[PDB]
A paper describes a structure:
[name] (LayV) was recently found in shrews and isolated from febrile patients in China, representing the first human-infecting HNV from shrew origin. HNV infections are facilitated by the attachment glycoprotein (G) and the fusion glycoprotein (F). LayV F and G are closely related to MojV F and G but distantly related to their NiV and HeV counterparts.
CryoSPARC 3DFlex analysis reveals this 310-helix creates a hinge-like pivot point permitting a ~20° rotation of the membrane-proximal region relative to the head-interacting region of the stalk that could influence receptor-binding. Formation of the 310-helix results from K85 being oriented away from and L86 toward the core of the coiled coil, positioning them in hydrophilic and hydrophobic environments, respectively. To maintain α-helical integrity, K85 would need to orient toward and L86 away from the core of the coiled coil. The equivalent residues are conserved in MojV G, GAKV G, and DARV G whereas they are respectively hydrophobic and hydrophilic in distant HNVs. Therefore, the [name]/[name] mutations are expected to favor α-helical propensity in the LayV subgroup and LayV [name]/[name] GSM had a twofold enhanced production yield relative to LayV GSM. To further our understanding of the role of the [name]/[name] mutations on expression enhancement and rule out a possible impact of the oP4h tetramerization motif on the overall LayV G conformation, we determined a 3.2 Å resolution structure of the LayV [name]/[name] GSM without oP4h.
Residue numbers in the entry:
A (entry chain D), B (entry chain A), C (entry chain C), D (entry chain B): 75 to 142, 166 to 304, 308 to 385, 390 to 607
Write the structure that this text describes.
Amino acid sequence: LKIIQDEVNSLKEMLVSLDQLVKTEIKPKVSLINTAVSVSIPAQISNLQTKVLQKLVYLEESITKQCTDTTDDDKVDTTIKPVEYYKPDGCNKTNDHFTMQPGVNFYTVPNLGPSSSSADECYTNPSFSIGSSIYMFSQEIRKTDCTTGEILSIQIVLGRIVDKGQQGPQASPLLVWSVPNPKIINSCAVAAGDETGWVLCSVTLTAEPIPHMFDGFWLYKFEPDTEVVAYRITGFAYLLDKVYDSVFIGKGGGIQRGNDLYFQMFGLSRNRQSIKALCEHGSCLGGYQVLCDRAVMSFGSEESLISNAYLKVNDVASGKPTIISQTFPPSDSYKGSNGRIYTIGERYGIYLAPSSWNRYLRFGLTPDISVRSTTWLKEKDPIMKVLTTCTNTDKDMCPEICNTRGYQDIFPLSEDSSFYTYIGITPSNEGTKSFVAVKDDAGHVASITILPNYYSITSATISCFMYKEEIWCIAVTEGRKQKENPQRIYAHSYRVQKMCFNI
Amino acid sequence: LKIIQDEVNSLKEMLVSLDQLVKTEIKPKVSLINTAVSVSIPAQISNLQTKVLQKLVYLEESITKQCTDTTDDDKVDTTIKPVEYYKPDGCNKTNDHFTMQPGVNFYTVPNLGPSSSSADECYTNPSFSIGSSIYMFSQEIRKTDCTTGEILSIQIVLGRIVDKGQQGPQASPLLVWSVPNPKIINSCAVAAGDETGWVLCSVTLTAEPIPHMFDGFWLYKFEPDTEVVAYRITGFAYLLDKVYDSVFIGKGGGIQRGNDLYFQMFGLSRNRQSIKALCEHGSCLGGYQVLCDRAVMSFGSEESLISNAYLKVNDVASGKPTIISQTFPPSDSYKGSNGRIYTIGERYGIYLAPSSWNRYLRFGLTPDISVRSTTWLKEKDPIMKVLTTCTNTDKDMCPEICNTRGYQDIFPLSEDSSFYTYIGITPSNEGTKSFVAVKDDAGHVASITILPNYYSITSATISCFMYKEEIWCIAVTEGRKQKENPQRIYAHSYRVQKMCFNI
Amino acid sequence: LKIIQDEVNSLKEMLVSLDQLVKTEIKPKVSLINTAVSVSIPAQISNLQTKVLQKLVYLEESITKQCTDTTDDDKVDTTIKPVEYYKPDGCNKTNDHFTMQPGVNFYTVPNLGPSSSSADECYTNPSFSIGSSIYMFSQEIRKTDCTTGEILSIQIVLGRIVDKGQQGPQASPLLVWSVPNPKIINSCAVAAGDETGWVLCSVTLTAEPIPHMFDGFWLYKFEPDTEVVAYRITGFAYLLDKVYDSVFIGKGGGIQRGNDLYFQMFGLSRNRQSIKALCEHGSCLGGYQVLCDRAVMSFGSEESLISNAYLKVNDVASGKPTIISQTFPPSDSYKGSNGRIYTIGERYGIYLAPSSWNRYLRFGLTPDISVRSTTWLKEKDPIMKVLTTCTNTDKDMCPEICNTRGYQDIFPLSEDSSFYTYIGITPSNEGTKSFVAVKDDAGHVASITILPNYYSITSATISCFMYKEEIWCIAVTEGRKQKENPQRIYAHSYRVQKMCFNI
Amino acid sequence: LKIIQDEVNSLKEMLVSLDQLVKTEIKPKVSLINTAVSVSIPAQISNLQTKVLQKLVYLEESITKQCTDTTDDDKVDTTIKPVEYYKPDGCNKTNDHFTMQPGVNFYTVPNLGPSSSSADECYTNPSFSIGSSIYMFSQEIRKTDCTTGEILSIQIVLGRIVDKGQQGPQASPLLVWSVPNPKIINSCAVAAGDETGWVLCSVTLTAEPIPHMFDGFWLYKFEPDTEVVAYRITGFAYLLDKVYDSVFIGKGGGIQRGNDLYFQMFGLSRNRQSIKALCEHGSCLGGYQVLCDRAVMSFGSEESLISNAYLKVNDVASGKPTIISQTFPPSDSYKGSNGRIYTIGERYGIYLAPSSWNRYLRFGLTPDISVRSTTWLKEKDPIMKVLTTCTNTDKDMCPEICNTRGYQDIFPLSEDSSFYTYIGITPSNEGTKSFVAVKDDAGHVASITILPNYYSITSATISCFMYKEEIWCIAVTEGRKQKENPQRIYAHSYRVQKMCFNI
Ligand SMILES: *[C@@H]1O[C@H](CO)[C@@H](O)[C@H](O)[C@H]1NC(C)=O
Ligand SMILES: *[C@@H]1O[C@H](CO)[C@@H](O)[C@H](O)[C@H]1NC(C)=O
């Protein structure tokens, strides 16, 4: 028996030595190689190409004629920049119209994140954000039913945007992570800054979880070639404006400004006051105001409303972050829904998806992130026409009790959001049809048809950046190639052209 | 004893942690690196080379004179395209003949798939197909005897065709897989489409297997960076036209059209009717018709015939595929054999290898995959002269009872198969001799000798594609370098030149 | 029980086989790949770029006009060279002043060595040295308190300086190692030569260690793709000039000359003689001499002084090295401190950091490494203004009892150190401010502000080399990006410009 | 106890699964990556460089003026070719002398094979051969004493010669292997052909081994990405001409011609006849003939001689090789020694190292590998002056009883070996001095000094090939950098220039 208690001890020493070898020598070197081949070499080849071709241009000029700063110094990878809006330089003449249009191509961006073949799995609720160099992506994997199924796993993919010699920008994953205990999460969303990514997840109560109940938040910090740091925000670490029974983090993601993070949230809150719901519609014909009020109530109850709010995460650098919210009144909003926080130069913007009877674009601008300073846009495009149970029309948009569960955001191409890019989706008898469009400040829309070989697309989120000194955008969508396929997440890219037309 | 039940439990935790590390971190990163070095970097360097050289061409033009679309957007890798047939543009003049000829080079394409040195192993029955970007390859590994030996393993190698700076196209393996329980498989064949590969295997009964008996099929789906999905097709999931005792899948492979797969099959079927076998021969001299009838019977039995059939796999996207066959009558065919399904523009073609007394090319064209719509070609070349026990001549091809076990297919270079490329093999007293040839529509054959340093080549299969805007072909053959070597699978490439001769 | 003693034995055989596979096949190949992607490929691409661009230059010259040695042969990597000082070629004219200035850029050099996110860890006491091709880096990781905390680990990173297509030189790690039993080390420092690195560590006594006691040294030899060789230097293997109770190795590092190594050391030594401390100051007004004497005493004791010494490691190639020291008298120095040994052509230099009341630059030159041959410079810049408890002024620098714990070295750009480069740090109410400067031989200083987005920088060490045929320097600093961050080590690079001004 | 017999079984399943994963997925992919980064990418970049630079040359020609085959098709890697001797094209004029000289550079070729830092290990007896694309290298590792120490291991390194953008050719290892049971091996040598390497080892008897006794041979076959195949040649599988008590394989290596291998061997053989030893010397003055006879006897015994022989390995492709030898008479040779077999066009050559009193070059040519057809050269250079106990002079070379244990071979640069390259070594009071030289057919020697920073070099072997269309040579030597270093194996390269001088 001593030899046994001895032989087992021998196995322990051999197993520990092997485990140390894999963690100490091999894992580190494999990570270094991944970066060298996926990021660094492509960057070196790209710089070579640019310099050689530019010299050849000077030779072309010479033959015909003779016959026959400080800002990028702290950057690791300078392939992309934050968006620098186009200006009408020289388009201030009589009858000379400055506009923007999408290009004719819609290129694939493969391997944005991992996937699978199992028909029992569904990929949904993508959250995508592009920072100054890096991108954050997150995808929920649910069992069978996509919307009401169990969460099997949430996957976060930190990576970089690089130039690989293709017609558009390409993704390069550096770190993939799987959130522990996914079964107790209501929702997660991402945010990104300078070489740092953030994830904020809202969690629930347990008895096995108790569905859509609220019990604080988790915050995760992601860095290149570094371990993930988790923080628990509970107890007195958070303060909500209204009392919430159920809290969700808005799908579209958040932003980082200085030492604070901003996210959009929505949820089910307690109410002890009468309301006058916002009720804007066309020439439909008292009854409509009643419907507008019942449209924001949970189960028709005067005391429990579904509403939107701003969520601020304070002082992240201290290691002990706190959360403070500010809620929108029912008089200046519609039934609470998934939204997104934008940074627009020195100003901010907010997108709120349709979820009720009003299917018009709801997007606002503000000098600071607060409720009382928000000014709403008067544009209508896009109108959400999919994943809805509403029977009203796109002209009058009359109030009724119905629901919508889609998401189609926009990306501002100017400081006042007078110009913007979006993807439209129209239902048909054979899946869906869709297009890319840019709306100008005169109300005109330039549009090009996309993805003719996909059975259906149900959603879209857009993030733009500078690449090769012009604006490029990446769109992430959910859909199916063939009618019988499970739902998967796809990504494509396109360019925005500057044009000026002499009328 | 508790410390033992404790020390063992400690080993379990350490072993699980190590296993998770290798599967979670290392395997994924190694796969990403393989793609980066074998596919992505080569693509980037190739694009650089093309752009720089083209600019230099413009400079050459400048000096002398002054003194002294939407289709590839959804593609991951655009190195190759489906074949675009050459047209006689400007060869419509009097006495001006449009033709095609092979080039003078026959380049090696190394590492198409893995191999071994053991003299106890034989590599045979290759199945090769090139899709829109990817290729599928499969090789059987048998013990000692090559044809009648036990199957040790079947290996499937999914990979891509890339440009590595060599004189021709090169292979780049991405995924290698070994079919489980190979001992119960009669045969497997491959098919490929757009980034998806398929494998169909016919299986037998068990008591240890019972030789050449039939018990349904297995279908496997292969995708890049994805797990392999297997389906069992048995019970009422398949319906055969005739009752078969033994079913084999044709070696040459199949195609994918829309949501269906098409394969060629052959096997031993029950018969209750009299027959009049197809019996076409030259000026040999009642007795011949009798021999032609007994040539298609198993063991001379009127009731059991060996015949060919089309095999269709219906609705693969549903996850629950079914199989339906359609059998060729004995009056329009010869003893059943290994064949191949071709896609020729909007039309289809079928190749049937010689297996009996008739050794002439048997190839047909059809508007749809059915028996009654097939029209057979009247060309003879190539004539199979190897691996045969027949003693007839190449002129009269007189009926007798004999067998042939080779395979030499062709690849159409025009919609009506009036032009095509093939490899001829002629036996000698020192292994074999062979050549590459292209037959034109006037019946002329251009040919170039190949592989002068190989003792023998016994078979060949050809797949063609566009590369660097001209047609290139890859030939996969079985053979031996030196007389005493075991049989191995080799691959080489060549180009097809466009020529027009003013007579 | 036999089956158990048998099943365990089976596990042993399987575990040994697996461990051998990882050590024999995989580890070696991973190391070879790391070099190929991080060093060899970048070198090949860089050489291509240079040759192509130079040819294009000749074409530019041709168009306009016609219209419209043996020294690097033994080198593995020729990207960098030892510094070749600039000369005033053609600046010997009347009113024509030869000078040197820093460039305007300060580029990031990422991944010089590994790091971490834990807030409980602090990275301090960096030691950095650049050899003929390779570099040595070492960083101490302490728990919580940075200066008085426990040592958790010391990490040594041997690597190479390479060209990766960026604006400046970049680091490429080859070997990372962790010194065993870090808890018994007083301090470590690095040195580097031709493809060989060295580390010298001073160790203490144990009872758990006994704080700042002395018990000999360890020497480690580092080579590329090779195991680390350790030597113990104790007993009669070392001889110190004075009797030391506590010995530390100077932070800045040492040099290799022929078969010997030279390091700076300092420590607490026994004294039986009266002293007259060096006491140089300005127009402050007997009392000052008394303060100057008590400033070099430990706890005010006449018998125990803190002093500097040279440390020589003799005959390293024999495998049995020995150590001999030579101590500086209190009459020609100040309280002992961290320093650095320099090689300046055929001559040597020594830097001694401020640690007491005198905060002016203390740097000397010598024809050989000995105390009696050292001649001190009369320059003042830089003056250390951070990490000090002194209340004197930068003009008079009056004696008092105080302490300083910073480190800001210089790098000579000429044989007589009449020109040199340094980094200045000035404290403010919001962390610190800093700049890069080059002082010329007329006493003028050219300076450029750096790192505007870093809350604070507390130290700097500079190493220079030739790159792309001009002098480039890498500065390694300790600091924080945001006020609440833990301390981390950062590295940046800049260039030194040659200028000549016609007055 | 059942739970124990159960928990152990669980560990077995987990360990087997992990072992299969590492062998099935990871090992294969790592090997593919090594080739991609070390061989394939460098080849692609090199081809780019050549094509771009050649176009630029044509542009240079254009500006000034206008103003201001089938043989490599079967090759995997075409970087190098077998030597094509230079011809005096246009040097057939009066007073116009055709010659060859070495270049001035002697470049390092790093990582030819692995090494170590342990001072207890010595690397000796290198065997190096270059084939049509690949190279074979083998190094013995002995404990402490280098010549009489125990063999710890023999390491074989199969690799390729590639272009990495450096001034000369570089090595790229693909497969490293360690011969099992090295303790029973007398000696090993390598040979190489077309993508196949061979190793032949002579083994001894065991009681623990019995020193220098003979018991047959082992043959190993090495192929890229393939397992090593071993064969035992014993019993009646070999037949030696004379009866040998002890057999060694000549250090320099062998060749492959068709299906046979040729090696040089030497050993201790039985003798029953009187002898008349070859005794060629200068004007020294019966006694000398007696010394010449005793110089070839073992321990002075008439019945036991030390002699050379040819060793042929017959029919390697069959898998059952046999060995037949043919011995040189004492009347046409000197004491047996290490030699080398050369292929010189259609003819063969043999090199025999000095081992006795005659220290002049001994090299012969033959139309076939046999004793009776060998014709010896009359050149003297090089004369071996190191590792000898002889006291005779380089002029008369008088017979005595002494021994020499060096090795300095030559490489023919012409069909008749009238031109050749060699490395000379001259002893001094400070290690050794050496040079590279080329001897022409007029007896003139061009020489250049090498390795000025190496304490000593004791041996050299040379293999030449075509690279960038001119002859390049790699020399492998044994030596020490610093006096106190252990012996290690180094490799360097140089070029042979074609010159023609008008007198
Ligand atoms: C050949 O076809 C071209 C059109 O592709 C036509 O322009 C030309 O006239 C035709 N030539 C003859 C001889 O028919
Ligand atoms: C040298 O040989 C060339 C042929 O290679 C021949 O044309 C020439 O005339 C010869 N010159 C002399 C002097 O023989």
